Coordinates of all heavy atoms in Angstrom, one line a residue:
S1 N 101.7 71.2 83.5 CA 102.2 70.7 82.2 C 101.2 70.9 81.1 O 101.5 70.9 79.9 CB 102.7 69.3 82.2 OG 101.6 68.4 82.4
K2 N 99.9 71.1 81.5 CA 98.9 71.4 80.5 C 98.6 72.8 80.3 O 97.7 73.2 79.5 CB 97.6 70.6 80.9 CG 97.7 69.1 80.9 CD 97.6 68.5 79.5
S3 N 99.3 73.7 81.0 CA 99.1 75.1 80.8 C 100.3 75.7 80.0 O 101.4 75.6 80.4 CB 99.1 75.8 82.2 OG 99.1 77.2 82.0
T4 N 99.9 76.4 78.9 CA 100.9 77.0 78.0 C 101.6 78.2 78.6 O 102.6 78.6 78.2 CB 100.3 77.4 76.7 OG1 99.3 78.3 76.9 CG2 99.8 76.1 76.0
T5 N 101.0 78.7 79.7 CA 101.6 79.9 80.4 C 102.3 79.6 81.7 O 102.8 80.5 82.3 CB 100.5 81.0 80.6 OG1 99.3 80.3 81.0 CG2 100.1 81.7 79.3
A6 N 102.3 78.3 82.1 CA 103.0 77.9 83.3 C 104.5 77.9 83.1 O 105.0 77.5 82.1 CB 102.5 76.5 83.7
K7 N 105.2 78.4 84.1 CA 106.6 78.4 84.1 C 107.1 78.0 85.5 O 106.7 78.6 86.5 CB 107.2 79.8 83.7 CG 108.7 79.8 83.5
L8 N 108.0 77.0 85.6 CA 108.6 76.7 86.9 C 109.4 77.9 87.4 O 110.2 78.4 86.7 CB 109.5 75.5 86.7 CG 110.1 75.0 88.0 CD1 109.1 74.3 89.0 CD2 111.3 74.0 87.7
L9 N 109.1 78.2 88.7 CA 109.9 79.2 89.3 C 111.1 78.5 89.9 O 111.0 77.9 91.0 CB 109.1 79.9 90.4 CG 109.8 81.1 91.1 CD1 110.1 82.3 90.1 CD2 109.0 81.7 92.2
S10 N 112.2 78.5 89.2 CA 113.3 77.6 89.5 C 113.9 77.8 90.9 O 114.2 78.9 91.3 CB 114.4 77.8 88.4 OG 115.5 76.9 88.7
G11 N 114.0 76.7 91.6 CA 114.6 76.8 92.9 C 113.7 77.1 94.1 O 114.0 76.9 95.2
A12 N 112.5 77.5 93.7 CA 111.5 78.0 94.8 C 110.8 76.9 95.4 O 110.2 76.0 94.7 CB 110.6 79.1 94.2
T13 N 110.7 76.9 96.7 CA 109.9 76.0 97.5 C 109.0 76.7 98.5 O 109.3 77.9 98.8 CB 110.7 74.9 98.3 OG1 111.6 75.6 99.1 CG2 111.5 74.1 97.3
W14 N 108.1 76.0 99.1 CA 107.2 76.6 100.1 C 106.8 75.6 101.1 O 106.8 74.4 100.8 CB 106.0 77.3 99.4 CG 105.1 76.3 98.7 CD1 105.3 75.7 97.5 CD2 103.9 75.7 99.2 NE1 104.3 74.8 97.2 CE2 103.4 74.8 98.2 CE3 103.2 75.8 100.4 CZ2 102.2 74.1 98.4 CZ3 102.0 75.1 100.6 CH2 101.6 74.2 99.6
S15 N 106.4 76.0 102.2 CA 106.0 75.1 103.3 C 105.3 76.0 104.3 O 105.8 77.0 104.8 CB 107.2 74.5 104.0 OG 106.8 73.6 105.0
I16 N 104.0 75.6 104.7 CA 103.2 76.4 105.5 C 102.5 75.5 106.6 O 102.2 74.3 106.3 CB 102.2 77.2 104.7 CG1 101.5 78.2 105.6 CG2 101.2 76.3 104.0 CD1 100.8 79.4 104.8
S17 N 102.3 76.0 107.8 CA 101.5 75.4 108.8 C 100.5 76.4 109.3 O 100.8 77.6 109.5 CB 102.4 75.0 110.0 OG 103.4 74.1 109.6
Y18 N 99.3 76.0 109.5 CA 98.2 76.8 109.9 C 97.8 76.7 111.3 O 98.2 75.7 112.0 CB 97.0 76.6 109.0 CG 97.2 76.9 107.5 CD1 97.5 75.8 106.6 CD2 97.1 78.2 107.0 CE1 97.7 76.1 105.3 CE2 97.4 78.4 105.7 CZ 97.6 77.4 104.8 OH 97.9 77.7 103.5
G19 N 97.1 77.7 111.8 CA 96.7 77.7 113.2 C 95.9 76.5 113.7 O 95.9 76.3 114.9
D20 N 95.3 75.7 112.8 CA 94.6 74.5 113.2 C 95.5 73.3 113.2 O 95.1 72.2 113.4 CB 93.4 74.3 112.3 CG 93.8 74.0 110.8 OD1 95.0 74.2 110.5 OD2 92.9 73.7 110.0
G21 N 96.8 73.5 112.9 CA 97.7 72.4 112.9 C 97.9 71.7 111.6 O 98.7 70.7 111.4
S22 N 97.2 72.1 110.5 CA 97.3 71.5 109.2 C 98.5 72.2 108.5 O 99.0 73.2 108.9 CB 96.0 71.8 108.4 OG 95.8 73.1 108.1
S23 N 98.9 71.6 107.4 CA 100.1 72.0 106.7 C 100.2 71.5 105.3 O 99.5 70.5 104.9 CB 101.4 71.5 107.4 OG 101.4 70.1 107.4
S24 N 101.0 72.1 104.5 CA 101.3 71.7 103.1 C 102.6 72.3 102.6 O 103.1 73.2 103.3 CB 100.1 72.2 102.2 OG 99.8 73.5 102.4
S25 N 103.1 71.7 101.6 CA 104.4 72.2 101.0 C 104.6 71.7 99.6 O 103.9 70.8 99.2 CB 105.6 71.6 101.9 OG 105.6 70.2 101.9
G26 N 105.5 72.4 98.9 CA 105.8 71.9 97.5 C 106.7 72.9 96.8 O 107.6 73.5 97.4
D27 N 106.5 73.0 95.5 CA 107.3 73.9 94.6 C 106.4 74.9 94.0 O 105.2 75.0 94.4 CB 108.2 73.1 93.6 CG 107.4 72.1 92.8 OD1 106.1 72.3 92.7 OD2 108.1 71.3 92.1
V28 N 106.9 75.7 93.1 CA 106.2 76.9 92.7 C 106.3 77.1 91.1 O 107.4 76.9 90.5 CB 106.8 78.2 93.4 CG1 105.9 79.4 93.1 CG2 106.9 77.9 94.8
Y29 N 105.2 77.5 90.6 CA 105.1 77.9 89.2 C 104.6 79.3 89.2 O 104.0 79.8 90.1 CB 104.1 77.0 88.4 CG 104.6 75.6 88.3 CD1 104.5 74.7 89.3 CD2 105.3 75.2 87.1 CE1 105.0 73.4 89.2 CE2 105.8 73.9 87.0 CZ 105.6 73.0 88.0 OH 106.1 71.8 87.9
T30 N 104.9 80.0 88.1 CA 104.1 81.3 87.8 C 103.2 81.0 86.7 O 103.5 80.2 85.8 CB 105.0 82.5 87.5 OG1 105.9 82.1 86.3 CG2 105.9 82.8 88.6
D31 N 102.0 81.5 86.8 CA 101.0 81.3 85.7 C 99.9 82.4 85.8 O 100.0 83.3 86.7 CB 100.3 80.0 85.9 CG 99.8 79.3 84.6 OD1 99.6 80.1 83.6 OD2 99.6 78.1 84.6
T32 N 99.0 82.5 84.8 CA 98.0 83.4 84.8 C 96.8 83.0 85.7 O 96.4 81.8 85.6 CB 97.5 83.6 83.4 OG1 98.6 84.0 82.6 CG2 96.3 84.6 83.3
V33 N 96.4 83.8 86.6 CA 95.3 83.6 87.5 C 94.2 84.6 87.4 O 94.5 85.8 87.4 CB 95.9 83.5 89.0 CG1 94.8 83.3 90.0 CG2 96.9 82.4 89.1
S34 N 93.0 84.2 87.3 CA 91.9 85.1 87.2 C 90.8 84.8 88.3 O 90.5 83.6 88.5 CB 91.2 85.1 85.8 OG 92.2 85.4 84.8
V35 N 90.3 85.8 88.9 CA 89.2 85.7 89.9 C 88.1 86.6 89.4 O 88.2 87.8 89.4 CB 89.7 86.1 91.3 CG1 88.5 86.1 92.2 CG2 90.8 85.2 91.8
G36 N 87.0 86.0 89.1 CA 85.8 86.8 88.8 C 86.0 87.9 87.7 O 85.4 89.0 87.8
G37 N 86.8 87.5 86.7 CA 87.1 88.5 85.6 C 88.3 89.3 85.7 O 88.7 90.0 84.8
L38 N 89.0 89.3 86.9 CA 90.2 90.0 87.2 C 91.4 89.1 87.0 O 91.5 88.1 87.6 CB 90.2 90.5 88.6 CG 91.5 91.2 89.1 CD1 91.9 92.5 88.4 CD2 91.4 91.4 90.6
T39 N 92.3 89.5 86.1 CA 93.4 88.6 85.7 C 94.7 89.2 86.2 O 95.1 90.4 86.0 CB 93.4 88.4 84.2 OG1 92.2 87.8 83.8 CG2 94.6 87.6 83.7

């Protein structure tokens, strides 16, 4: 809500389980993401 470029990806959900037995889940936004100068 504090990002002017965030947009809810309507209807999208996610849920993941990893090889170590950990997990997480939620909903989805699209937004601008940069790593080390690459956007």
